[PDB]
Design an enzyme around this catalytic site. Structure first.
Site, PDB file in Angstrom:
ATOM      1  CE  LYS A 161      -7.965  -0.520   5.650  1.00  0.00           C
ATOM      2  NZ  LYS A 161      -6.852  -1.014   4.829  1.00  0.00           N
TER       3      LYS A 161
ATOM      4  CD  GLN B 239      -7.008  -4.772   3.838  1.00  0.00           C
ATOM      5  OE1 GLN B 239      -7.868  -5.606   4.123  1.00  0.00           O
ATOM      6  NE2 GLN B 239      -7.303  -3.509   3.563  1.00  0.00           N
TER       7      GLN B 239
ATOM      8  CG  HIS C 199      -1.893   1.108   1.295  1.00  0.00           C
ATOM      9  ND1 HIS C 199      -1.568   2.341   1.818  1.00  0.00           N
ATOM     10  CD2 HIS C 199      -3.196   1.186   0.934  1.00  0.00           C
ATOM     11  CE1 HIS C 199      -2.623   3.133   1.764  1.00  0.00           C
ATOM     12  NE2 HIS C 199      -3.625   2.456   1.234  1.00  0.00           N
TER      13      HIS C 199
ATOM     14  CG  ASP D 112       0.604  -2.326   5.971  1.00  0.00           C
ATOM     15  OD1 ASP D 112      -0.356  -2.371   6.770  1.00  0.00           O
ATOM     16  OD2 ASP D 112       0.562  -1.667   4.910  1.00  0.00           O
TER      17      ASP D 112
ATOM     18  CB  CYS E  87      -3.827   3.313  -1.794  1.00  0.00           C
ATOM     19  SG  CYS E  87      -5.050   4.613  -1.495  1.00  0.00           S
TER      20      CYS E  87
END
Ligand SMILES: Cc1ncc(COP(=O)(O)O)c(C=O)c1O
Ligand SMILES: Cc1ncc(COP(=O)(O)O)c(C=O)c1O
Lengths: 410, 408
Positions: free
Chosen positions: A229, A206, A126, A203, A369
């Site tokens: 999220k 997700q 991202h 990261d 993104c």
């Protein structure tokens, strides 16, 4: 999929907990990869804080609430010590994953990066895990290195060993791609990273909402994700880090609440985590984030994981039955965590989502993104559908019927 | 010392009923609004309504834009045709982040070795340490504006400390400890005359007095929504359009870009340029509702009532022989905050006794330790007033202080 699997995702015991979905039962929201819908308990927790806990006005609670929230977040990601005590003092609050990655790139980059060093990321990243490294590499003279994909949209062990060498100082890789849905082997990347003496940043924006996350099994030094999220409120990000690394890293933002004392010419920093939290924090959002953790714990995150596995498999399977639909990522549903990117052949993603919006189907169109990844695959624009545990078989069938409508016009 | 009509005006409270935490619990006297305010029902409801009905896209995007326009109008950021300069409003988490943004971005853009950064001894820590950091990084010198015996910055001090070497001047509009209102317009005039930029910390002035960025002639201004009946987690930074275009980005990542390659990136226009990642759209929406709530009360009535509450608070503290005001003894010279001490009694002891009486004040350094060191104070108490306070709240503090003195 088996018949018992289709029956499990046909039923929906969860969508009633979400006021926006209960009040609008015709809407199929398939953009959870951008942000979740909010459970009623989370919305109520935020209002309850402002009604009864704001500034501890009824002291004759709020401070303990933030600590209780750090502990539940620390547990949730497996950040517990040898004696099952949550590592609450290793949880740092930001506005989102993006600020947490800017914090790491600025603080860890200033601490560790010298000219000639390598910062290693992947082509799947991202934008929030790309540009901060572009900036700090230009400031320090370090080199930005990219891990490439193979043909099944995976990072191979050979690529891990070839790009992460003795020159590497920082490695930052996404746990789950927000476009491909690929789940990277963070544990294997961290093993090679630690063998080269480098820091491992993850990261997890997700992966935290969709799969079980244990920071001690993942062998990472730092990890960031966003509350909005995983059914939490907007405006809350989380950064976990190893205790001694956070102690050594210099502060990011400076000002009130992050000091121990201040003079005209100098200042003394507060201990971690207050060292990294400048100014008045969003205590109501932190409290509602703890309510989101308690809500997800009540549903059992293992059962959420399995249901979202089934929904991802059903989504790809139905998408594959459409001859005019090309999936951008992997064609196997077992290889998708959360998101499935695709394109209707010869139709602008703007036109696809416009028709689906008329059919009460919410999906995501654009670059998501992840422009370097799309450039790499010669895609200028893409549609993206994503599943969450509050989706069901009928939501995906609504997408398919809407896509068939799209083909009729175009 | 004030008319019977003015005392009658502050005995009535035609505002408390809008605040759930205060209206439902009449035993509580909350006098720490200088730290954070209480939330009105319409603000709490707006935040929940966003999550329930438009948590995203078209409605949410237009709701964000209308909040920017409402905030721009509220601070007088309007053009010649009275259109709000909504594109000059930048959202942060709080004033602290906005000042870090300015210190890093404007400091990189403008500061040379040998430049002066001028702040005041009154500054909150968030308007001190970012300047300490950027001055060490750029080779600039940190200069302090000092006070006179009346806790004010004189024109002589302005002309003496702001010289040709000055490149950035960042002064608080209203001190969060002394309540002193600094002549920002006059400081800006000397600042611009010396070829420097004018930054205003308006965290204590945006909630309490009328703010007009075009009348102040400042270049950048920041404040926090949570001090003016808005939600926590929302800060606002206004700046001149040309300056914000020249300042390099602060946080980078998604949503603040036009395009990205493996090696480079092109920045999005202002204000998206300075907003990285997913924003707190519900908090922004609730901040617009806080603006509309304050507009409905008429901000001129809020100011007028708060001047009377501060005058009453100062005159009542003056009647206590065991209390020493830290700051001006004149009630008319306090905007919001009144710092004081019960002599020979630690502020933590004062605050603990007032806690049992359901009186909330702030005790300690109040994030202004350089100011307290300058005044040879180690720690003070601080009581502060808002428009939803009334004469009963202040009398309950005065009674609690009599109880403190009877104990110690
Ligand atoms: C004058 C002043 N400036 C800046 C700040 C920082 O505010 P916040 O905690 O919202 O960042 C405060 C506190 C303040 O009173
Ligand atoms: C994989 C990934 N990383 C980082 C981010 C940034 O998240 P946020 O907008 O909350 O900062 C997102 C979006 C994401 O999907």
């Amino acid at each position: 999929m088996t018949d018992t699997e289709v029956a499990q995702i046909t039923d929906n015991p969860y969508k009633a907990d979400f006021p926006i979905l209960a009040a609008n039962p015709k809407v199929a929201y398939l953009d959870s990869a951008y942000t979740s819908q909010r459970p009623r308990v989370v919305i109520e927790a935020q209002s309850r804080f402002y009604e009864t806990m704001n500034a501890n006005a009824l002291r004759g609670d709020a401070t303990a609430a933030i600590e209780d929230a750090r502990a539940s977040i620390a547990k949730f990601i497996g950040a517990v010590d040898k004696n099952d005590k949550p590592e609450s003092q290793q949880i740092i609050f930001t506005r989102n994953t993006s600020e947490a990655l800017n914090l790491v790139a600025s603080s860890l980059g200033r601490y560790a990066l010298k000219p000639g060093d390598d910062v290693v990321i992947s082509i799947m990243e991202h934008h929030s895990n790309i540009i901060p490294w572009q900036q700090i590499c230009k400031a320090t003279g370090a080199n930005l290195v990219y891990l490439r994909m193979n043909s099944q949209y995976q990072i191979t062990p050979e690529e891990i060993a070839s790009k992460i060498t003795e020159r590497a100082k920082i490695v930052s890789v996404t746990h789950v791609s927000n476009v491909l849905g690929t789940r990277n082997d963070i544990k294997a990347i961290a093993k090679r990273t630690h063998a080269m003496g480098a820091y491992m940043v993850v990261d997890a924006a997700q992966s935290a909402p969709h799969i079980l996350v244990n920071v001690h099994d993942l062998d990472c030094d730092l990890l960031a994700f966003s509350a909005h999220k995983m059914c939490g409120p907007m405006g809350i990000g989380v950064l976990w880090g190893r205790a001694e690394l956070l102690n050594a890293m210099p502060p990011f933002l400076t000002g009130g609440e992050m000091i121990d004392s201040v003079t005209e010419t100098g200042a003394v920093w507060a201990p971690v985590p207050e060292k990294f939290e400048a100014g008045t924090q969003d205590a109501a959002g932190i409290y509602a984030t703890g309510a989101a953790i308690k809500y997800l714990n009540g549903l059992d995150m293992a059962k959420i994981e399995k249901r979202e596995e089934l929904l991802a498999r059903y989504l790809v399977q139905q998408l594959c039955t459409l001859d005019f639909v090309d999936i951008v990522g992997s064609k196997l549903g077992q290889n998708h965590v959360g998101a499935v990117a695709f394109n209707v052949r010869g139709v602008h993603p703007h036109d696809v989502s416009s028709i689906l919006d008329m059919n009460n189907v919410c999906i995501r169109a654009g670059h998501h993104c992840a422009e370097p990844l799309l450039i790499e695959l010669h895609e200028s624009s893409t549609c993206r559908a994503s599943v969450a545990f509050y989706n069901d078989k009928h939501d995906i069938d609504q997408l398919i019927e809407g896509l068939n409508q799209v083909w009729k016009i175009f």
